[model samples]
Target chain A: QIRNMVEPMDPRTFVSNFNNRPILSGLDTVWLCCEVKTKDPSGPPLDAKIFQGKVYPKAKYHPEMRFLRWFHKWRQLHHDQEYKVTWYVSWSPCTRCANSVATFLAKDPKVTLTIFVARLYYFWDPDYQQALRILAEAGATMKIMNYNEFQDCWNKFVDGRGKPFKPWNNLPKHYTLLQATLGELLRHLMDPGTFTSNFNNKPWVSGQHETYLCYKVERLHNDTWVPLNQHRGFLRNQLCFLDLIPFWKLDGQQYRVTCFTSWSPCFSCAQEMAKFISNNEHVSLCIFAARIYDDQGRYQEGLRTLHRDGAKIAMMNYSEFEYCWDTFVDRQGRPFQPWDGLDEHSQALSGRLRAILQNQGN
Target chain B: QIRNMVEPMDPRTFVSNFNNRPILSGLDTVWLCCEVKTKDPSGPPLDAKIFQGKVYPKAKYHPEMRFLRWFHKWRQLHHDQEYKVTWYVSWSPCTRCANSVATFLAKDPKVTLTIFVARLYYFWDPDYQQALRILAEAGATMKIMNYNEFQDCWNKFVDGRGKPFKPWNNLPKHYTLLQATLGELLRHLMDPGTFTSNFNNKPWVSGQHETYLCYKVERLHNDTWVPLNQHRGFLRNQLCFLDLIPFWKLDGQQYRVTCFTSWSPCFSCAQEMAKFISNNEHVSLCIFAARIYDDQGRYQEGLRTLHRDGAKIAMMNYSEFEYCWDTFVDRQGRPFQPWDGLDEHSQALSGRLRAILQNQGN
Candidate 1:
C-alpha cells in the first residue's frame, strides 16, 4: 500500500517538486474540447436556450485548436495523466486535429474517448477511420456518429408547409423542447455506470452533489405533429453532474440550455455548495442562472444563489446555431452526403452544448 | 580596414541565433542554472540583482550551491572550449561567489563582476594578492583595495574625539579654510597643461556661466537646511562640477564637508578626454568625505558668494551616507573618532571647529 505523500515543505518547494514529478493521482485530470464546423446554408441560424430553465444563447465561433495546445503544454509541465477528448466536427479532420491527437497521446497512455461526427454515410471514409484507429490503438475508445437518425426524426416531425414542429415556432418554446430532449439524453448517457463512464462522470458535478438530465420534448398542434411547447428542468431533486452539461442545439434556431444541480437543503446551503465547488482544485462550476426561495421572484434569488454558491452563472438571449450537419446511413456518389444532414444539426447541437458547458458567454 | 563587422547585427537577434546555432558564434554554450536569488528573508527569495543598485532590504536569500550540478553539465556540453575564469573580490568571499564564478566561466570565456565581488579575499587567511593576480591574468581590470588599507583608513577617522574639526563652532573661519583648500585643489587639477592638455587652458576663477560650478550649503542645526544662510550661500555661488562637487552632511550635532573634482566639464567631456590616457577608466575624479568643513570666519563671504552665483545645490544629512555605504562597502564602520587617543593639543582644534559650524539659535 502506498502512503499519501505529505510533508510541511514550503509552498514553493512543494509546487516545484510536484510539477517535476510524474502524476500519481488520476482525480485531477480535465478533458475539454471545442466543436468547430462551417455553417450550413439551408438551416436556420443557431439560437440560445433556457438551460435548466434559464436563458443562454449560442456563442460566437471559437476554434479549440489553440486552447488544446495551451492546455496540453500546461499539463505536460505539471505532469498530469488522464484525459478524454471528442470533437463533434462537421468537416474532415485537418492537420491541427491530427497533431493535437498525436501530441496528447505521446504525453500520457491513459487518455481515451475520441469521437468524430460527420454528415450521412461519409463516416466510412478510410482517412477518418484511420484517424479513429490511431486514437483507439493509443488506449482511446473511439466513436463515429453519422446523424441520420436525428435528421430523419426532425424531418418526419416537419409538415409539408416547410414549418418546423409548433414548439419551435417561438425561440423560448423551441429551446424548452431542445433542453428537455438533450437533458434526457444526457441523463441516460451520464448513468455513472456506462461504457463511457470516464466521460460520463463529470467530477465537477459529483463534487457539487448534483446531476444533469436532458430531454427532447415536442408539443402537438392542429392535425400536425409539431414541436410546440418544450420544457426542461431538474428531473430529480438530487442534482447530478449531467445537469451541468448543457443542451447543444434545438431545431432551426440553435438555442442553448444548461442546468446546474446541487445538494443544497436551502438557499444558503446551495450558496455554500457553490462556493465549495468553485474553490475546489479539481472541479470548476459555473452557475449561469440561480433562484433562491427567500430572494423574491425578481431573479434576485438567482443572483444570490450564484453569489453564495460561488459558481459561475450568466444569462443571455437564445440565437441560431452556427454550424449544422446532416447524417445518412449511405450515399453512392455524394462523398460529403454519406450521413443524414443531421450531422450538421448535431454539429450545431454540439456547438451550443459546448458554449454552455465551457461558459463561452460572448 | 575591418568594416566594423556589419555593426554586429542586432544584439537580441545575434544572441538568439547564437543560442540556436552554437557554431555560428563560435561559442559553445549550454543552459546552466536558470535560478533566482532574492535578498528577502521571508518570501521565495530566488532573485538576484541583475544590475547594480540599492535593493529593497526585505528580499529572500537563495543559496548558490544548488547550481553546481547545472554548471558542471554546461561544461560537459561545451567540451571544446578551453574555459577559464579568474575572480577578484573586495570583501571576504562567500559560497555565492564560488558558485557564480564557476557557473559563468562554464557558459562563456568571460569574467563577470558580481562573481568577482563574491570571491574577494574569501578566507580568514586572506589571499588578496593572489586574487588580484588571477583577475589581472583574466583580463579583468578590477581594483582590489586590501583589507589592511580599508581598516587603516576606517580606523583613522571613525572614532576620534577632543578638538577635532567640527563645522559648527565658528562657521566663517571653518568655511574659509574648506573653500580655500578646495579652490586650490581644483585650480591644480583643472590646469590643462598639468597632466593632459584638455584641462590646462581652463581658468579656475571663472564665473559660474563659464564653468559648471554647482554647490549646496546646508544648515545643520535646523530640521531643514535653508538656502539663505550667509556662509552656505557663499560656497554655493563659488563651486560647480568644474571647480568642485561640494555637499554638506548636516545634522543637529554637526556640519560635514565633502567634495569631488571633475576630470573634465561633464561626463561626456570626461569620456572624450579618456581617449588620451592609456589606463583612463579608473582615472576619473571620484572622491568623498564626511564631516570635514566647519564654520570659520568665511561664513559671511561663503553665503554671499553662493547667493550671487547660480550653483546647483543640494543638502543631505550624514545618516543618509551611512545607510547608502553600509551596503556598498560590506560593513558599517564608525563615523567619527575621538582625539583623546591623539596628542594633547589636537583636542583643542576639534573643539574649535565644532563651535563654528553649529547653529546659533535665532
Candidate 2:
C-alpha cells in the first residue's frame, strides 16, 4: 500500500533537507523522516516496509499526506492497538495538507502524532501560522528542529552508514533563530491576549492592578546620616512629591534615595526617574522591585537607560521583603511570615533582572 | 589626568577585539569602550579626555584597573557629585582585576559602574565564574554583548566614519551560545538550590507535597459504552492497582483511560505508564495535567517518549479543569470557583508542554 517505502536519504537529499543556508533555489521538494510504532508491542514485527526512513511526496499528495494514505491501510492490519507516527520534516505543512492532517487526527483517537520541522512554510502569512495553529489544536505536537534533532535524523534516516552528522555552516545560528521565531509565532497565535500584554499594556505580573512604592531619603551632614524624607505611595504620587522639592534646596549636600516597588517601573516612569537623577548631582538611588514587569523587549531598554544614568536596580530578596513589611505594612505587633517559594521566586526575578540590565540586547 | 585619553578604535583593532573566532593566537590584548557622564548635569562639559573612546590595558594593570586609577584623580576635582562609568570591554575581568573593581564598587556608593563583556576570561575555571559573580554581588551590572551592542560600540568607539558594523563569521552562533553558558554559570553561582532543582530532585512547582490523580476507564461493546474501572489515587498506588488486573480480561475489548493529574508524570512514572500502554493494544490514554514538572531538560525526554508510545498528553485547560472539579471534588453543592490567572497559568503550562514534546532539544 505504501508506494515510497522506507528508503535512507542520500547525502545530496540530506543536504537539501537540512540546509541552513538562506538560499533561494530548489525548495519545491519536501523530505520527511517518519518513525512508526505499533500499538501492540508483541505484534508481528512491524512491516519491514514501515520502520523509519525518508518519505517523498506523490504527484498529488505532499509527503505527509502521502504517508497518511499508507498509514490508513497499515492500521487495518495493525488493529485493536494504538499507532504513533513521529514526523521530522524539512518544511511544515501548507494550509491544504495541514487541514487534512488535522481532520485525520480529530477522527482517529487511536493515533498520536508529533511533527518536528526544520522550517516553516510561508511562516509570515497569517494563513500559514493559523494552519500550524489549528494543527496543534487538533492534538498534533509541533516543534522546530535544532542541532540534536538534525543529528538524530541523520543517524536514523540518512544513508550515512558509518558517517557522523556534519553540521552545515551557520547551523546553530539559523536554527536557533528559527526556533525562537516559531515559538513566538505559535505562542502569539495560541494566546493573543498574553502576546499583546507583553507588546502593549505591559501590565504587572500575577493580575496586579496597581504599583506600590515605598521610599526613604537620607542626607549626610557632618559625617552622620540624617533622615530627610520617608514615604510610601504609588509611583505617580511619589513623582508629585519629588516635583514639590525645589532643586536648589538639594544643593551642596549628599543624599541617598532608596525605593522598594511592588513592580518595576514602567517605561515612562523609568524615564522620568532617570531624568530626576540626572538633574541632581548629590543624589544616588537604589531601587528594589518585588515583581518584574513582563515587557522586557521594550521596558528593558528603559531600565537599561536608567541603569546607565546611575540608578541601581535589583530584585527584592528576603532581607528587603522583611524590611518592607516592617517599614510599610501596618503590623498589628506581628512579624513577617515568609511565603512558600519566596526565595526561589526572588532568585528567579534577580536572575532575570541581571540578564536585562547586564545583557546588552533582548 | 587619564593616560590613554579618548581615542577611537581602528578597524583592525576592532576586529581583533570583538572577534568571535576560536583561534589560538594573539589573545593578550583587551579593548574597552569607556563612556563617562558628569554627576552634575550643569557641571563643566566633560573633559574631552573622558568622553566615549577605546582604552587599552596598561603594562601593569588591565584596562579596567587602568581606567579606575584615572577616575581616582578625576574624582578629586569632580567633588560633591556622583560619577558614572560604563565599560564595554572585549574580555571579562580575570580574578585579580575582578576583585579590584569589586572592592572599589563596595566602597563608593556615589560612583556607579556597569560592564558589558564580549567574552568571558577563562570561564571554565571555578575562579572565573566566581569572579564575575562577585563583581555582580558588589553591585556592578554585568552583561554579554550581542549584535545591537556591537553596532552601538562601533558607532560610539570605533573609527567607522560612515561604514556600518560588519559582522564576523559565526557571529550570532558564537555569541548566542556564549550568553547561554555565561547566564547558566552566573545563575548557578547566584542560586545553587534552584539550579540543582532543575537538574536534580525535579520537584513539583509551587511546593506541592504530593501528587493526586483522578482516573476513569470505559469500554465500547455492541455500540454502547460500559463503565469498567473508575477510581482516584496517587500515581504510585494507581500503578499497583493496574498490576493486579489480568491482561486476558482486557483482550478484544476496546477501552479508553482518562486521567486528570495534579502534576504531570515524573520520569519513572511516565516510563511505567508508557510500558502499560505498550503492553495492551485495546487501551488508549488521555492525560491532562494541572502542572508541568520543571525538569524539562530530562523530564521532557520522558514525556516525549511517552507521547511517542501513543499516550495523549496535555495541560488541563478551563474545560478540563471544570470537568475535574465536578467529577472529583467533594463539592458540597457549591459551584467551581476558578482561581485568578487560572487560564493564563494553564495556557503557559500547555505551551511549555507543547515545546517539550514537539521541540527536540534542550
Candidate 3:
C-alpha cells in the first residue's frame, strides 16, 4: 500500500500541468519590509498596516491571516484608495489549508498579490515542497518571516521592558510544535534538488546559474566592458556562460551559436584546407582579414567607430612610435602606419585578424 | 498518543525498579579486541579470541561480535565450562548475523547472557552511555575505544582520502539534515542538567566531564606521572594513567566532592588538579594540602606537612647569612660548622631563615 503511494511515474504517461500557472505577473514594483521589534513601541507599531495602506492594497486575503491582520486593518482604513491584493500564508498550515488558500485566492481578479508566509514550522514529509510550489503558482508572492523575531517582540513586551500584554498567556502551547512541523516543510523546500532547480532558469534571482556566469564575466573584465579587448575576453567569458546554455537536442548539433567569427565566409574558406587535413571544423576561417578590413575606417571614423563599439584600445607609449598612429595616413589613401602601430588598429586589424586566422587554420 | 508516549513519569506512582532482579553480576577478565578488515581471505582476523578448548573455545566465530557474543561463543566452545554462568555484552553489534546466533546459543545452560544493545551506526551517539550502564549492570568489563582511536583506524582503512563507508550506503543525503539531527542530539547530551542527571550516574561510563578533567591534569603535569622537575629531562618517556571514578549520582554536590581540588601538594596533585578542573568542578581547599605533601618526600616531609597543616614557618637561604648558623647538621643532630663566624647569631639566623623561606615558597 505504501509502495503504491511512492510508485515511480510511468515513462509513457504525461503529468498534467493543471496547477502550474504564474501566481503573479506584470508587477512593476514590490516593497518587502521586514519589521524588527524596536523597543520604542510609543514611536510606531512593528506593523504591516503602514506598508499595506501606503504601498500594496490589491493584496488578496486568506483565513490563516496572522501576518496579514495588520495589513487588513490598514486596508479597511484606506478603503477608497486603490491597492494591490494581499495573500496570507502561514508556514504552520497543513497541505489541505495550503490547497484551499491557493484555490480560493487564485480565482481573484487582481493582477498582483503580495503574500505573507510564516516560517516557523518544519516537517520531514516530502509532500510539503509540492504544497509550497502550489502556493507559489497561485499568484502568491510568498515572504517567509522567522518566529524568533515575533518571540523577541513578545518577550520584550511581557517582561516590563516595553508595553505590557498578557491576553494569550494561558493559551495552549502550539507554536513550538508548529515550528518543528514548519521546519521540516522548509527543509524540504530548501532541499538542493527541489529549491535549486526551481530558480535555475530565473537569472534575475541572485545566485542562479545565469547570474553566476554574468558575475564571472564581469569579474573577468574587471566589471567594465572593454570593446577592443572584448573579443578575446568575450571568448574567455564564454567558457563560463556555456554552462547556462541549455542544449536544444541530444544529438549535439543544435547548440547556441555564441562565437561571432563563425558567420564570416572568407575566414571559413581560409581554414578549409587545414580543416580538411585535420578533420577540424572550419570555424576559425570565419574570422578573416576581409571582415576586419570591412570593419575598419578612416582615422576619425575609426576613432568614432571604436568609441561607439566600446573598444578598449591599449594606448601606445610616446617613445614607442614617432607619430600618432590614430592620425597617421599615407599618400595612397591608406594608413600611413602599419596596423599594429595604433592600439585600436592593432586590436582591430592584427589581433582580431590573428585570432581569426588561427581559428581558420584549426 | 505521541504525547502519552512522551509524558513524564508520575513521582508518586513511580516504582523503584521494574522487574528488578538485581540485573546481573559476577565476572572476571574479558578479552578485548578491535576488528579490522584485510584484503586476504586467509589472513588472521583482526580481533582476539578467548575461552579456548574444552567447554570453551579460544577462537571467535566472527570479528565484530560484541562482549555478549564472545561470552556466548565461549560457552558453546566449552559446553561444560561454568562460572556460575558466563555472560557477554557489547558496545555495538559485532556481525549482522551475531544477534540471531546469540539468541540461538541461549539454549545452552552454561550461557547466561545480556546484550548492551546500541546502534552500531553513528558510534558517536551519546546514548551509548546507556549501553555502558547496561553492560555495567551485567558485570561485563567495558572495553570502550574513543572517537580519536576509531578515526585513526578509519583513516588507515580509507587511506586518509575519503569519507568512511557507512555499513549501509543509507546515510542522510543532505548535509543540513544530518547536521540538524546530530547537532540537536549533541546539544541534549552535553547540557549540564542532562549530563548530571542521566549520564553522570552511569558507573562504567566516564562521561565527557571526567574525561576532560583527566586530560587537563595530564596536560598540567606535562603528561608525566612524577614531579615536573624530577622528570623534566625524561618527561617524554613517562605515561600518565587516568583512573576512572564511579559516578552514581548527578547532583552538583556529589560531583564537587568526587572531582574538585584546589592547590596541588605535590607533582601528582598538579596532574590530578588539572583533571578535576577540566571536568568543570570547582576546586576546594580540603584536598589541597594532601596533594602537595604526597610528593615532597621524607627529608622535607615535616616542613611540607606543617605547611599543609597551615603552620607558618620562617624561610631561609644558605648564602644570605653573614655568620654560618648551623650550616651543617650531623646525623646525630649536632650543629657543626655553624655560628662559628664573626657575625651576630640572631642576625645570621634571621637572614638565613628569611632566604630559606623565600626560596621554599617559590
Measured by TM-score, the strongest candidate is 2
Sorted on TM-score, best first, the list reads 2, 3, 1
The residue ranges of model 2 lying beyond 4 angstroms of the native Cα positions read A1-5, A11-30, A39-81, A90-108, A116-152, A162-362, B1-5, B12-30, B38-77, B90-108, B116-151, B162-362
DockQ for each numbered candidate:
0.00, 0.02, 0.03
Candidate 1 per-residue lDDT over residues A15-121, each given as its tens digit: 22112111122213111222211134343312211101101122111233444554455456644544444443323233235334544553444444344332211
Decide which is better by TM-score, 1 or 3: 3
Tell me the docking grade of candidate 1.
incorrect
After aligning candidate 2 to the native by TM-score, how far in Å is the CA of A253 from where it should be? Answer: 68
Better of 1 and 2 by TM-score: 2
Q: Write the per-residue lDDT of candidate 2 for residues B85-119, one digit (tens) a residue.
A: 67778888877677778767755667677788887
Candidate 3's DockQ is 0.03
How should the candidates be ordered by DockQ, best one leading?
A: 3, 2, 1
Q: What is the TM-score of each candidate against the true structure?
A: 0.15, 0.40, 0.24
Q: Candidate 1 local accuracy as lDDT?
A: 0.28
Write model 2 residue lDDT over A74-108, tens digit each, in one string. 67775577776778888888876777787677556
